[PDB]
Scaffold this active site. Structure first.
Site, PDB file in Angstrom:
ATOM      1  N   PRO C   1       0.816  -1.211   0.000  1.00 59.79           N
ATOM      2  CA  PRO C   1       0.000   0.000   0.000  1.00 59.79           C
ATOM      3  C   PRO C   1       0.839   1.245   0.000  1.00 59.79           C
ATOM      4  CG  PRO C   1      -0.969  -1.606   1.427  1.00 59.79           C
ATOM      5  CD  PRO C   1       0.347  -2.139   1.021  1.00 59.79           C
ATOM      6  N   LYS C  32      -1.515  -5.511   5.796  1.00 61.04           N
ATOM      7  CA  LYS C  32      -0.312  -5.811   5.030  1.00 61.04           C
ATOM      8  C   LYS C  32       0.901  -5.518   5.898  1.00 61.04           C
ATOM      9  CE  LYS C  32      -2.508  -6.822   1.258  1.00 61.04           C
ATOM     10  NZ  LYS C  32      -2.589  -8.234   0.770  1.00 61.04           N
ATOM     11  N   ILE C  64      -2.997  -3.025  -3.658  1.00 57.11           N
ATOM     12  CA  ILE C  64      -3.363  -4.226  -4.409  1.00 57.11           C
ATOM     13  C   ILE C  64      -4.375  -4.993  -3.582  1.00 57.11           C
ATOM     14  CG2 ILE C  64      -2.601  -6.285  -5.503  1.00 57.11           C
ATOM     15  CD1 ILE C  64       0.189  -4.926  -5.810  1.00 57.11           C
ATOM     16  N   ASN C  97      -8.575   9.777  -2.379  1.00 62.88           N
ATOM     17  CA  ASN C  97      -8.938   8.926  -3.479  1.00 62.88           C
ATOM     18  C   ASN C  97      -8.360   7.513  -3.259  1.00 62.88           C
ATOM     19  OD1 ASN C  97      -8.386  11.703  -5.750  1.00 62.88           O
ATOM     20  ND2 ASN C  97     -10.367  10.747  -5.161  1.00 62.88           N
TER      21      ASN C  97
END
Lengths: 114, 114, 114
Positions: C1, C32, C64, C97
């Site tokens: 990330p 993660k 992801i 976003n």
């Protein structure tokens, strides 16, 4: 909506009032209230366009809806016009990436817009 | 294509000629004419990778087409190689986000590419 | 990330330890490992939110997977909470976003995550 402009034009060349102008014009163009428009100008950048460091801009417009072929053509005319008039950047040295964001993929005020 | 690199490496560590090198090599790798390649390097950033402030980079490559698994593998080898050779950033400290832009979502020269 | 915050808050107002706090909290939120979390803070920006220049932020979180309505609501609560506590930015002046990246569209270590 959120509009970001990254440019090699120097800070002193950005006119006072440019953020407000962008806010007003983007509120009109998108139809969204100005309270929801965010704008961000990043001058003095190390960048090139076509191998050249003449004035250029790399920009992004993100919106929840109000994005599409015809709308984006109109936004491009608008925003290249502003960048040419205010920052003296040639329209052919501007790229604007448009993003139609899903409401659930925009965070705001501790949650999303969903 | 538009390539952006954000790094904590200092400005003085970015060698003369780097934006032109990037332009040239991206034109070759993507197959696009160099006139359409835009590059942007943002040094001296406050960033970390894996919790560490050793040299790192966060990058983006946007292109209208020419994006996919094999192409992106190729781009990553190229770009990590340049960041390692020129900026002394380890390849395992670089993230590159790839974006396949629809032509209608890229503004340029008062209109879009659609 | 990868998390990136752009804000008009001045650099001196970003507290020591902030990048590590972001890294830790994001590892946890996304599940993660922190070794895979990258963070980037860009202060002193020329920006406006809703037509005004009180403290604000424009941010992105790319991952992801681990992106969706509920998860993004969770992330927004977390990140707005950190930006309010540490940078004194009102949550209603923050946009984030969110991007769910395909593994083949993230370069790292000379290849992609595919």
């Amino acid at each position: 909506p959120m509009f970001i402009v990254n440019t090699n034009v120097p800070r002193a060349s950005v006119p006072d009032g440019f953020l407000s102008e962008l806010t007003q014009q983007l509120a009109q163009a998108t139809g969204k209230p100005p309270q929801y428009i965010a704008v961000h100008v990043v001058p003095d950048q190390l960048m090139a366009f076509g191998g050249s460091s003449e004035p250029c801009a790399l920009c992004s417009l993100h919106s929840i809806g109000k994005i599409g072929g015809a709308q984006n053509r109109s936004y491009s005319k608008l925003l290249c016009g502003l960048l040419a008039e205010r920052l003296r950047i040639s329209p052919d040295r501007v790229y604007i990436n448009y993003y139609d964001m899903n409401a659930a993929n925009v965070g705001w005020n501790n949650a999303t817009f969903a």
